[PDB]
């Protein structure tokens, strides 16, 4: 379907499987997701994660590192959850909400 509708739905699903089904102590901080933008093809998607812990890079760096290392696990969960064709490749990014 349209990339933005799939973007909204995938934001919902990533937020869900990010709040509940994680066990990495590197993650935490009520990690939210501001949104996710994906290409016209649904093959690739970029998530904009927003952390809470102090914005000091020592921690948000570790958070994005853990997310990128668990991307395979999150992709498997997404593929079983949200019922689409290709299970896009995920790329996490710190959304600098404070500007």
């Amino acid at each position: 379907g349209r990339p933005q509708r799939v973007a909204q739905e995938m934001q919902k699903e990533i937020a869900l499987i990010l709040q509940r089904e994680i066990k990495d102590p590197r993650l935490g901080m009520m990690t939210t997701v501001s949104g996710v933008e994906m290409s016209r093809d649904l093959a690739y998607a970029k998530v904009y994660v927003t952390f809470l812990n102090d914005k000091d890079e020592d921690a948000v760096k570790a958070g994005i590192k853990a997310l990128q290392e668990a991307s395979g696990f999150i992709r498997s969960l997404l593929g079983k959850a949200m019922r689409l064709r290709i299970v896009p490749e995920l790329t996490f990014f710190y959304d600098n909400s404070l500007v």
Partner: protein
Amino acid sequence: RKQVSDGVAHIHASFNNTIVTITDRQGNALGWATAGGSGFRGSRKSTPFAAQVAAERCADAVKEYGIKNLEVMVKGPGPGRESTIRALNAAGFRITNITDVTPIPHNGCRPPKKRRV
């Protein structure tokens, strides 16, 4: 109108809205503002900026009750938890603890079917 000086803020952070309500420690509510009722609709109805706007609009309606000590309980992993938290933190309030209290069942009821989009 009275003095409690120690309240708790429920933050229902839906994927389409954000409902912040400050209540007495025994569940009796005081006031509330919504991301929708803050002059936002559609997408902006569920954006973090509108969430903090609603948080501040709700704080401005309970200040006459005289509180600056809060525990907050968030529900729903919607965008607009971070926002309202830092908002009511920037509203001169002292937050002692923030707690995830989203209702998670032990396989209670069957969820609605996935959207084919």
